[PDB]
Design a protein around this nucleic acid. Structure first.
Ligand code: MG
Ligand code: MG
Ligand code: MG
Ligand code: MG
Ligand code: MG
Ligand code: MG
Ligand code: MG
Ligand code: MG
Ligand code: MG
Ligand code: MG
Ligand code: MG
Ligand code: MG
Ligand code: MG
Ligand code: MG
Ligand code: MG
Ligand code: MG
Ligand code: MG
Ligand code: MG
Ligand code: MG
Ligand code: MG
Ligand code: MG
Ligand code: MG
Ligand code: MG
Ligand code: MG
Ligand code: MG
Ligand code: MG
Ligand code: MG
Lengths: 205, 292, 58, 159, 169
RNA sequence: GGUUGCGGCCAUAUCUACCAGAAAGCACCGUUUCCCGUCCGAUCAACUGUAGUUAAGCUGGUAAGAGCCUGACCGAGUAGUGUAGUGGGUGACCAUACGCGAAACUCAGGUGCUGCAAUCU
RNA sequence: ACAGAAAUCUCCAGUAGAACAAAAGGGUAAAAGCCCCCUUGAUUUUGAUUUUCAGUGUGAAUACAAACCAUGAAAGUGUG
RNA sequence: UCACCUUGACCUAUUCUCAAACUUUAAAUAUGUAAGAAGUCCUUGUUACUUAAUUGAACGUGGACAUUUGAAUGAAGAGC
C-alpha cells in the first residue's frame, strides 16, 4: 500500500512544497534531526564525520527515519548515547504526488522527500577522535537504507563548525571564541568595542 | 528604540527636502511640469515664504541641475523704502510682492508697459494684456506648505505682485474682506489690510484700553514716535519709493567672503582620519581592557 | 477526436522564406496622430513659405 | 480558462525596483522631447496613465508627436513575416532618451573636428572606426619577473 | 539649568466613557461643559463586541481638552479630591500622568438638575518649550533626547509644586 | 566657510547614542483686537521682534556603531550557461573542447555632493 | 474611576507589516489610505492610437483636438 | 515562599535546512535601437501654434563639407 521508492527516486519535477496552494500534505515521519548529546560543547566533540551523497536524487522521509534509527542505535550500543552528536542535514520539503485513466490525472499528495545533490551531507556526526571507527561503522550501516551511492568523508573541521582544526585552536587559545549552548560564538574585528568587551573578556591582552 | 538591521536595510528614505519638511513634491510636480509642446519655455513661480522676521519672494524657474532665481525681494530691504517695523505683516507682504513685481518688470523690459494698479484701491483685478504688445509676465504662486486660509499674507504678496503689473492667476476668495454668504470681496477691509489698518486699529484700541500691553508690543513704534493713524502714508510713500526705484541695491558685504570664510572655518569640527581612528581604537582598548 | 492544439514549429522558417521585411521608410512620413493644432499652424506656415519662395524667385 | 489581459505576465516588469518606490523625481518631467528624438520605453509601475503595453518594454523608437504630458512613439513590431509601424501614446515618465544617440552625435562632432584639422593640413586622416586589432610585437622583460610557477594541484576533499 | 528646559502642563483631557447614547451621555457632556468652560466632543465606538453593550459608531464617550491656566486649576481641584496621593503607577514612562475621580462640581454651579452622577478621567500631558517642532507643518522635527519628558523628571516636578507625595498610603 | 529660500541627484544623505556650534540666519519663544481655524490661539490664522533662550529643532563632529555606497587576481574563473563529439557512465549524472560568466562570502575604503539667489567676524 | 485580553482618552514607536468594493498580482505615505468641503468630466462632437488581431469586428484602454463645465488661491487635474 | 532543581511563552544573539505560484542580488543564451548626404554646422524666411519677448517649434532659402561619406563581412541584383 506504498509505492516503491524507485518511482520517486529522481528529481524529475520542480520542487512542490507545502504552501497555501498545497494544503493537504501528510506529515514527514522524520521529526527528530539532532540525536545523541546535542547539548555538548564544541570542544567536547572535535572530530566530524560526514555521510555525503554522490548522486542527484531524492531521499524519502521513510528512508531518513530508517537510516537515522540504525546509525543512532549502532552508535548508542557500541559507544554510549552521550558520546556522539548526530545531525540529519536534509529535510523532506518536497511533496510527492500519486495519481490513484489519464483524464484529470493530476496527483494528490503521497508523501515527503528530500532533494539532495552530489556533495551534500545527509548525516553529520561529531565525536571524540577515539570514536571514529564506531561512527564510520554506524554511517556505513546507515548507507543501506538510502538509495544511490554515499561516501564517508572525514571532515578537516573541528566539530560542526566551519573552520579548520588548527584554525579553531589558533582562535580559541587566543581570545576569539566563547561558548554557546550547543554551538560557539566568534569574536570579530567589527562592531562597538563596548559590546566586544561586554562579551569576550579574555581577549585584548 | 532598537531599529533592526533588516528594517535599516529595507528602509527607503524620502528625498532630502521631504525629510527636511520643506518641499511638497506632489505640489512641485504640478507647479513645475511644463506642457511638453512648449518645449523649453520656463515655468515661473512666485515663491513666497514667511519665516519669522523675514518675508522672501523669489521668481524662480526650474532646470535639470537646479532652480534658477530671476529676481528676489526681501522684507528686510524694505527699510530702504521706508518700512522699519512690522516686517512680516500683511502689508509688508504686499510691499514685498509689489517690489518683486516692479523688480522683475524692470529686469525684463516690461516696466513702461504693464504699470499695474498705480493707485491702490483694493479691487479684484488681473493685469490685462496690452493689445498689439507683449503679454504680461505670467507668474504662478508657490505658497509651499502653509495653509490656504482667508486673510493669509501669501495673498498679500499675491495682491501686491498683481498690482505691480505681473500676471498671476488668482481668484479673490482668499483676501481679507471675503464673506461666505455673498460671493463678494470687501474693498474696505482689503484696502485697510493693504495700508496696515488692522495693525493701526489695534494700536488705537490698546492705547485706549491698556498700556502695559501697548508698551510691550509696539515699543519700537513709540521709540520711532510713529502714530497709529500715520501708518497709511508710511505705506503709501513706501509704495511710491518701490515704484520709483526697485532695482535691487545689495548690501556692503562688509568683511569680504574670504575673511568670512577663514573666520567661520575655526568653528568647524574637522573629520578624523584612519590614523587617528586606529590610534583611538588602540588607546580605547588599552584604557578599557588593560586591567584598569 | 483529440488532435494537435498549437505549435509554432516551422513558422520562423516560413517567415524567413521571404525574409522578414522592414517597412521601407520615406522622407515626409504622414501626420497620422500628429497634434491637430500643430497641423493647422503647419498648413499656414507652409502656405506663407510657398509664397515667400514664389516672391524670392518669380 | 486562459487569461490574456492587457497587463498579464507583468508581475515583475511593472514592479518598482527595490528602495525606489514612491514619487518620480523631477528631471523626468523636465526633460524635453523633440519630434525625431530616439527614446527608450520603460513603464513606471506607479503611473497607470499613458502606460505602454508590456510588448514595448525595452523597445526604442522615434518621437513623432508631442502633446500636453505625452509623446507619441513610432515602434517597429514584427507581426508574422513583416514589420508594422506602431504609434504609441506614452507619458514622459515611461520615456527616457537613448544614450546611443548622445554617443553617436559626439562621434559626428569628432568626425567634423578631425576633418577640419585634416583640411587645415594633412588630408586622408582615416576617420572611420576599426574593430579591435591583433596585437603587435612585444618584448617581455624578465626583470624582477623570472617566470616561476608550479604544477596542477593534487585532489583534496576539504570537507 | 536653562529656562527653556522647563517642564510645563500643556493640556489636560477629561474623559467620561458612557457606553451608550442618549440623555445620560448628554448630561455627561453637560457636566464636562460648565467645568471646562468649553463644549466637549463625543467619541464614536470603533467596533462592536456585544459584551459591553456597545455598537460600532455609537458615540459612547465624551472628552474635552483644556490648556493653559484653566487646566492648572482643574488639576488642583482633582488633586484636592484625590488628597494628593498618586501612586508609583499613574505616571507614564513618557512623563504624562492621570487619575480618576467623581463628583467634584460642588462649586462653580449652574441651574443643576441633579439626576445621576458621572465619574471622570483626568489625564495630564507634560512637555517643554519647543514641542512645536513635532506639531508644526514645516520642518516637522523630533524632540531631542535631553529635552524629552521622563517619568523621573515629571515625578520630581510633581513632588515639587503642588508639593504632593507619590506612592504613599 | 557658516546660514537662509528654492532646488538637482535621492541614505556616502538614513538610524542609535553622546558632545560642541562664534557671527548672522533659522528656530523655539511673546500676544489675541483684526482675517481665519479649532473641544483646546496645541495645530492653523493674525500681530510684535517686543518679554527671553541656545534647552530643543537645525548644523557639525565622535563611535574597532547598525545600515548604505564603492572597489578587490577575496571567494572564483567557482556555480550556472551557449556550442561540439559514434566522449564516459546501466542510469543518475559527469569530464573534456571552444566561449561567456554570477551571488553569498571575505577584506579594504568611504559616510552626502552640488546649481541659482541672498546674507554673515 | 467603573474598565479587565477586548469600550474610551494620552504619549511614544511604527517604511506600511493597514487601507484602497469584489480574485490575484502590480501600485500608492504632507497619498491613490482616512476625514471634511465643493461638485457631476459617469457630459458633447468626431477622428487617431494600443491590446486582443486578419493588424477585421467587439470589449477595454491611451493621448490629443473642438466645446461646455467642475474643482482649487493656483499650477494643474478630471472624457467614470 | 502566602522569594524556592522541577517556568508556557515572548524577546535577544546564534544554528541545521528549503520554495512553480518567495526574494535584496543575478548570469549565459535569446532580444530593442544606433553606427549619418533624408547627415552635420553657419546665416535668416513662414505661421492663425507657442513664448513675457521671432522665445521656441516645425518646415524652408542661401552657403561649407566628395566616398575612409563616418565599424565588419557578404550581397546571391534591389524594390514593387
Ligand atoms: Mg510490486
Ligand atoms: Mg513532471
Ligand atoms: Mg546506499
Ligand atoms: Mg509628496
Ligand atoms: Mg497643494
Ligand atoms: Mg466526438
Ligand atoms: Mg489540427
Ligand atoms: Mg516548438
Ligand atoms: Mg515555407
Ligand atoms: Mg510567413
Ligand atoms: Mg494573466
Ligand atoms: Mg501584475
Ligand atoms: Mg525589474
Ligand atoms: Mg482610469
Ligand atoms: Mg502660541
Ligand atoms: Mg463593492
Ligand atoms: Mg481585431
Ligand atoms: Mg481582414
Ligand atoms: Mg474582454
Ligand atoms: Mg477609463
Ligand atoms: Mg481636457
Ligand atoms: Mg469606465
Ligand atoms: Mg478615467
Ligand atoms: Mg519556470
Ligand atoms: Mg530574485
Ligand atoms: Mg550595420
Ligand atoms: Mg515651442
Amino acid at each position: 500500500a506504498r509505492r516503491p521508492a524507485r518511482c520517486y527516486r529522481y528529481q524529475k519535477n520542480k520542487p512542490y512544497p507545502k504552501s497555501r496552494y498545497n494544503r493537504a500534505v501528510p506529515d514527514s515521519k522524520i521529526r527528530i534531526y539532532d540525536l545523541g548529546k546535542k547539548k555538548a560543547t564544541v570542544d567536547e566533540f572535535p572530530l566530524c564525520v560526514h555521510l555525503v551523497s554522490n548522486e542527484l536524487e531524492q531521499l524519502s522521509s521513510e528512508a531518513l527515519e530508517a537510516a537515522r534509527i540504525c546509525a543512532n542505535k549502532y552508535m548508542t550500543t557500541v559507544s554510549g548515547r552521550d558520546a556522539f552528536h548526530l545531525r540529519v542535514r536534509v529535510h523532506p520539503f518536497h511533496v510527492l504526488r500519486i495519481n490513484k485513466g489519464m483524464r484529470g490525472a493530476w496527483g494528490k499528495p503521497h508523501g515527503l522527500a528530500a532533494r539532495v545533490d552530489i556533495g551534500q551531507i545527509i548525516f553529520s556526526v561529531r565525536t571524540k577522535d577515539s570514536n571514529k571507527d564506531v561512527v564510520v561503522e554506524g554511517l556505513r550501516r546507515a548507507r543501506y537504507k538510502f538509495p544511490g551511492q554515499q561516501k564517508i568523508i572525514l571532515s578537516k573541521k573541528w566539530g560542526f563548525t566551519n573552520l579548520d582544526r588548527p584554525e579553531y585552536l589558533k582562535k580559541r587559545e587566543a581570545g576569539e571564541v566563547k561558548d554557546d549552548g550547543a554551538f560557539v560564538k566568534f569574536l570579530s574585528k567589527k562592531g562597538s568595542l563596548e559590546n566586544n568587551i561586554r562579551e569576550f573578556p579574555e581577549y585584548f591582552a | 528604540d532598537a531599529k533592526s538591521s533588516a528594517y535599516s536595510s529595507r528602509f527607503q528614505t524620502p528625498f532630502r527636502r521631504r525629510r527636511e519638511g520643506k518641499t511638497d513634491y506632489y505640489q512641485r510636480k504640478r507647479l513645475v511640469t511644463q506642457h511638453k509642446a512648449k518645449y523649453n519655455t520656463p515655468k515661473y513661480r512666485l515663491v513666497v515664504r514667511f519665516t519669522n522676521k523675514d518675508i522672501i519672494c523669489q521668481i524662480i524657474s526650474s532646470t535639470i541641475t537646479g532652480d534658477v532665481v530671476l529676481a528676489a525681494a526681501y522684507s528686510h530691504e524694505l527699510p530702504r523704502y521706508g518700512i522699519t517695523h512690522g516686517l512680516t505683516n500683511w502689508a509688508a507682504a504686499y510691499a514685498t510682492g509689489l517690489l518683486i513685481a516692479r523688480r522683475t518688470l524692470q529686469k525684463l523690459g516690461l516696466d513702461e508697459t504693464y504699470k499695474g494698479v498705480e493707485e491702490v484701491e483694493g479691487e479684484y483685478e488681473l493685469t490685462e494684456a496690452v493689445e498689439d504688445g507683449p503679454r504680461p509676465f505670467k507668474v504662478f504662486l508657490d505658497i509651499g506648505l502653509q495653509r490656504t486660509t482667508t486673510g493669509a499674507r501669501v495673498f498679500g504678496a499675491l495682491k501686491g505682485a498683481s498690482d505691480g503689473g505681473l500676471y498671476v492667476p488668482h481668484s479673490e476668495n482668499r483676501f481679507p474682506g471675503w464673506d461666505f454668504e455673498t460671493e463678494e470681496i470687501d474693498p474696505e477691509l482689503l484696502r485697510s489690510y493693504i495700508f496696515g489698518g488692522h495693525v493701526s486699529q489695534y494700536m488705537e484700541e490698546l492705547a485706549d484700553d491698556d498700556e502695559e500691553r501697548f508698551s510691550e508690543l509696539f515699543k519700537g513704534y513709540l521709540a520711532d514716535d510713529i502714530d497709529a493713524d500715520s501708518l497709511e502714508d508710511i505705506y503709501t510713500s513706501a509704495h511710491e519709493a518701490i515704484r520709483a526705484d526697485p532695482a535691487f541695491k545689495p548690501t556692503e558685504k562688509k568683511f569680504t567672503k574670504e575673511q568670512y570664510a577663514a573666520e567661520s572655518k575655526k568653528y568647524r569640527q574637522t573629520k578624523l582620519s584612519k590614523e587617528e581612528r586606529a590610534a583611538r581604537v588602540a588607546a580605547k582598548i588599552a584604557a578599557l581592557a588593560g586591567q584598569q | 477526436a483529440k488532435s494537435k492544439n498549437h505549435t509554432a514549429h516551422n513558422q520562423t522558417r516560413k517567415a524567413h522564406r521571404n525574409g522578414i521585411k522592414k517597412p521601407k521608410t520615406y522622407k515626409y512620413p504622414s501626420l497620422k496622430g500628429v497634434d491637430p493644432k500643430f497641423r493647422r499652424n503647419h498648413k499656414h506656415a507652409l502656405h506663407g513659405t510657398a509664397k515667400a519662395l514664389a516672391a524670392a524667385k518669380k | 480558462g486562459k487569461s490574456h489581459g492587457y497587463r498579464s505576465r507583468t508581475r515583475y516588469m511593472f514592479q518598482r525596483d527595490f528602495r525606489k518606490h514612491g514619487a518620480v523625481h523631477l528631471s523626468t518631467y523636465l526633460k524635453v522631447y523633440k519630434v525625431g528624438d530616439i527614446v527608450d520605453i520603460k513603464a513606471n509601475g506607479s503611473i497607470q496613465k499613458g502606460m505602454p503595453h508590456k510588448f514595448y518594454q525595452g523597445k526604442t523608437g522615434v518621437v513623432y508627436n508631442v502633446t500636453k504630458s505625452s509623446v507619441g512613439v513610432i515602434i517597429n513590431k514584427m507581426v508574422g513575416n513583416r514589420y508594422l509601424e506602431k504609434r504609441l501614446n506614452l507619458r514622459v515618465e515611461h520615456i527616457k532618451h537613448s544614450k546611443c544617440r548622445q554617443e553617436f552625435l559626439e562621434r559626428v562632432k569628432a568626425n567634423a573636428a578631425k576633418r577640419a584639422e585634416a583640411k587645415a593640413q594633412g588630408v586622408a586622416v582615416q576617420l572611420k572606426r576599426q574593430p579591435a586589432q591583433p596585437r603587435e610585437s612585444r618584448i617581455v622583460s624578465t626583470e624582477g619577473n623570472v617566470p616561476q610557477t608550479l604544477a596542477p594541484v593534487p585532489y583534496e576533499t576539504f570537507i | 539649568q536653562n529656562p527653556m528646559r522647563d517642564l510645563k502642563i500643556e493640556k489636560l483631557v477629561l474623559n467620561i466613557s458612557v457606553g451608550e447614547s442618549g440623555d445620560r451621555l448628554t448630561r455627561a457632556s453637560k457636566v464636562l461643559e460648565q467645568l471646562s468652560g468649553q463644549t466637549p466632543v463625543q467619541s464614536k465606538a470603533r467596533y462592536t463586541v456585544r459584551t459591553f453593550g456597545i455598537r460600532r459608531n455609537e458615540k459612547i464617550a465624551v472628552h474635552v481638552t483644556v490648556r493653559g491656566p484653566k487646566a492648572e486649576e482643574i488639576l488642583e481641584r482633582g488633586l484636592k479630591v484625590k488628597e494628593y496621593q498618586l501612586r508609583d503607577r499613574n505616571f507614564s514612562a513618557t512623563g504624562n500622568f492621570g487619575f480618576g475621580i467623581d463628583e467634584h462640581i460642588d462649586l462653580g454651579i449652574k441651574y443643576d438638575p441633579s439626576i445621576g452622577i458621572f465619574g471622570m478621567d483626568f489625564y495630564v500631558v507634560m512637555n517643554r518649550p519647543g514641542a512645536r517642532v513635532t506639531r508644526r507643518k514645516r520642518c516637522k522635527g523630533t524632540v531631542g533626547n535631553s529635552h524629552k519628558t521622563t517619568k523621573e523628571d515629571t515625578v520630581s516636578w510633581f513632588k515639587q509644586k503642588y508639593d504632593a507625595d507619590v506612592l504613599d498610603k
